[PDB]
């Protein structure tokens, strides 16, 4: 409780205030995003073969018994698909072919050669168009106590769907038959650089080829280039098409009208608000000379950029430069067209991840971070401005009760006096509850509670495996155990 004189104290003077941060410069643009192509190349082929079946029948006294049924597929030759099947819708009743290094000849019904009409097969639900010649199997007539042979030749034409995967050196048919030739092989137009596993006399091309439909009989109007390959089981025909305009190893995934591009040091950051994704690329562009069989990219990007620009950015924006290409992390190729508003005109294979969730977690983290740092940056500016503004009131309250102001500022109960700054040295009944009024402004902030995220899947890996009807591993394990369950593979005689 003393006077004052020696020790003197001054108030801190207004502090420099944090400045509103610079802000991010986004380039607006149009983007199309490409992913790895997983779907095979699909094309239409026609199979041309003959079911040849010979039966051996023993004739008892009251019964007859098959002693053997030999079944074989025989290819129709090139001259018969051109001069009989396509010309007249007909097929010769004789199969002449090479099976086991021998020319075998089979006559239908063991009768002389006849041209037999191809007629539509019986209707099945999810099948394609097929045509055949005979409905019945020929068996020999009964004469007693003999073995007799009987031959059936059924000429079958069916239109099948064909599938090929990268590097497009083979293709499959819907029957399950591998063809070890590229779909794009040929003798014309530089197509001989492709892969074939067959001898050259098995493959022919026909220009000016006119399909005659086996049902309607109408010859086609536009000619085609017809490939024809004679495999040892069948002849397949398909229309030739060049490889590069018909194959792309990269598939269009998303078209986005509003793609913002930002600078992230050594990298670009490409964000979408519609997809709620953001991708990270390098600043240097990806060259389209690096993508193997990638001719679809620049064509499908340019077709989608100008369609979006004429529906969204026609009179409000202008393009800047040509389309730019960037390889994002996770295996996404982003084609990007930069834009600018009308008020401001002064080889390898890309492998794409199955999960895009890193880009959606990157969007949602950045969209919260930018809001929280903006709002808390304003509270930091407004707090420094308010504390520098209350010094005016502290300089006037100091001259009224110096004892109370120096005790609130120094830290301990201090008696005070001034000369230009504070000189300061250290220092009934009852009625505890009088009516009270608050000079305080309340502020009730609560905490964000702890949340727990459980594992959640819509379909598990076990549910996706048994979604199909037939498991090939499970059917081959059951069928190869047939001898071990019903026979004796050990005992002789």
């Amino acid at each position: 409780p003393p006077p004052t004189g020696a020790t003197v104290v001054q108030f801190e003077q207004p502090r420099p205030c944090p400045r509103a941060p610079d802000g991010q410069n986004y380039t607006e643009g149009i983007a199309v995003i490409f992913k790895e192509n997983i779907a095979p190349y699909k094309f239409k082929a026609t199979m041309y073969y003959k079911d040849v079946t010979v039966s051996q029948v023993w004739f008892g006294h009251r019964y007859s018994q098959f002693m053997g049924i030999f079944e074989d597929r025989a290819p129709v030759p090139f001259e018969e698909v051109i001069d009989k099947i396509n010309a007249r819708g007909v097929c010769r009743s004789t199969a002449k072919y090479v099976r086991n290094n021998m020319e075998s000849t089979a006559f239908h019904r063991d009768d002389d050669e006849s041209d037999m009409k191809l007629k539509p097969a019986k209707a099945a639900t999810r099948t394609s168009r097929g045509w055949h010649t005979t409905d019945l199997k020929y068996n020999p007539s009964r004469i007693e106590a003999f073995h007799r042979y009987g031959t059936t030749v059924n000429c079958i034409v069916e239109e099948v769907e064909a599938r090929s995967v990268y590097p497009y050196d083979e293709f499959v048919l819907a029957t399950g038959d591998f063809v070890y030739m590229s779909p794009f092989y040929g003798y014309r137009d530089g197509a001989h650089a492709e892969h074939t596993a067959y001898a050259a006399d098995r493959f022919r091309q026909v220009d000016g080829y006119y399909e005659r439909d086996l049902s309607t009989g109408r010859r086609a109007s536009t000619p085609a280039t017809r490939n024809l390959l004679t495999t040892p089981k069948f002849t397949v025909g398909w229309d030739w098409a060049p490889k590069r305009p018909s194959v792309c190893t990269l598939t269009k995934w998303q078209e986005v009208d509003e793609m913002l591009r930002a600078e992230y040091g050594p990298s670009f950051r490409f964000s979408s608000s519609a997809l709620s994704t953001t991708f990270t690329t390098n600043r240097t562009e990806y060259a389209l000379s690096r993508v193997d069989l990638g001719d679809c990219v620049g064509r499908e990007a340019r077709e989608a950029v100008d369609r979006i620009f004429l529906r969204r950015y026609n009179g409000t924006h202008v393009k800047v430069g040509q389309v730019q290409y960037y390889l994002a992390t996770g295996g996404f190729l982003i084609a990007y067209q930069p834009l600018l508003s009308n008020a401001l005109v002064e080889v390898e294979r890309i492998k794409t991840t199955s999960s895009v969730e890193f880009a959606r977690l990157q969007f949602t983290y950045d969209h919260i971070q930018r809001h929280v740092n903006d709002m808390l940056g304003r509270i930091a500016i407004a707090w420094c401005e308010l504390q520098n503004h209350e010094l005016t009131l502290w300089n006037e309250a100091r001259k009224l009760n110096p004892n109370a102001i120096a005790s609130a500022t120094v830290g301990r109960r201090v008696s005070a006096r001034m000369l230009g700054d504070v000189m300061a040295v250290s220092t009934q009944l009852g009625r505890a509850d009088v009516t009270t009024v608050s000079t305080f402004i309340n502020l009730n902030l609560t905490m964000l509670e702890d949340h727990e995220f459980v594992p959640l899947e819509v379909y598990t890996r076990q549910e996706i495996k048994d979604s199909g009807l037939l498991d090939y591993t499970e059917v081959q394990r059951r069928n190869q155990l047939h001898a071990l369950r019903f026979a004796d593979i050990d005992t002789v005689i």
Partner: antibody
Framework: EVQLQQSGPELVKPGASVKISCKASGYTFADYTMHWVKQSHGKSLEWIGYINPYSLFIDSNQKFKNKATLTVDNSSYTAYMELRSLTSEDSAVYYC???????????????WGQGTALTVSS | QIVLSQSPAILSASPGEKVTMTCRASSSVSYIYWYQQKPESSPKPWIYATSNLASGVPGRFSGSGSGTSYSLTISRVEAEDAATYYCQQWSYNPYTFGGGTKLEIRR
């Protein structure tokens, strides 16, 4: 034996039109294409085009898209070639040649006509 | 428009020795063909499918090659071999022939 009998010599004025015939015998005419080649004096062989007598499909050289048109008389088994707007550079020997109606390793010009000497002068 | 550059344009050969021709193509062709022509006569098929001999040509003739490089060899040249030999392609439109090699014999 396979024989391709061709028209013969023909002198022709400039601007006129001429029609060369190639007659076939010894083989079935409908399942072989019929080609035409040009050989100028002291020069090499230039291809013109062909025609399939069965399908009337015509593939041709685009250097001769205004000069040559091709047609087939199915009854007489003869192939024709009509040269239009004859200038001086059309003076050459023209041959007709047999070729398969497909493309394989075998598909070559196995039989040739004797030629026709065509002179555009006055 | 496949040019078929063919060398040498003239080839002298004493009867009995082996000689060779060349046919270079501007791009790769599936097969090269060969045709001989004697003066005031039609061309004749000589070698098809780059190696297969035609109907009635002697066994002293042989061909080889693939892609853009092709050759025509004679094992022991005779006096009846003096002709003009054309290489030919049909892989692109239009069909094109070569300029021609001419065998002279040195008696």
């Amino acid at each position: 034996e396979v024989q391709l009998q061709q028209s013969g010599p023909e002198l022709v004025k400039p601007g006129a039109s001429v029609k060369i015939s190639c007659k076939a015998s010894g083989y079935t005419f409908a399942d072989y294409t019929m080609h035409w080649v040009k050989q100028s004096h002291g020069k090499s062989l230039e291809w013109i085009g062909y025609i399939n007598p069965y399908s009337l499909f015509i593939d041709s050289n685009q250097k001769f898209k205004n000069k040559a048109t091709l047609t087939v008389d199915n009854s007489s088994y003869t192939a024709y070639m009509e040269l239009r707007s004859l200038t001086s550079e059309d003076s050459a020997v023209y041959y007709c040649a047999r070729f398969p109606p497909y493309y394989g390793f075998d598909s070559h010009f196995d039989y040739w006509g004797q030629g026709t000497a065509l002179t555009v002068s006055s | 428009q496949i040019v078929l550059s063919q060398s040498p344009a003239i080839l002298s050969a004493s009867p009995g020795e082996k000689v060779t021709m060349t046919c270079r193509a501007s791009s790769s062709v599936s097969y090269i063909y060969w045709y001989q022509q004697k003066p005031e006569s039609s061309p004749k098929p000589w070698i098809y499918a780059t190696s297969n001999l035609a109907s009635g040509v002697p066994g002293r003739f042989s061909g080889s090659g693939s892609g853009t490089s092709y050759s025509l060899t004679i094992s022991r040249v005779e006096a009846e071999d003096a002709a003009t030999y054309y290489c030919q392609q049909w892989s692109y439109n239009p069909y094109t022939f070569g300029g021609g090699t001419k065998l002279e014999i040195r008696r």
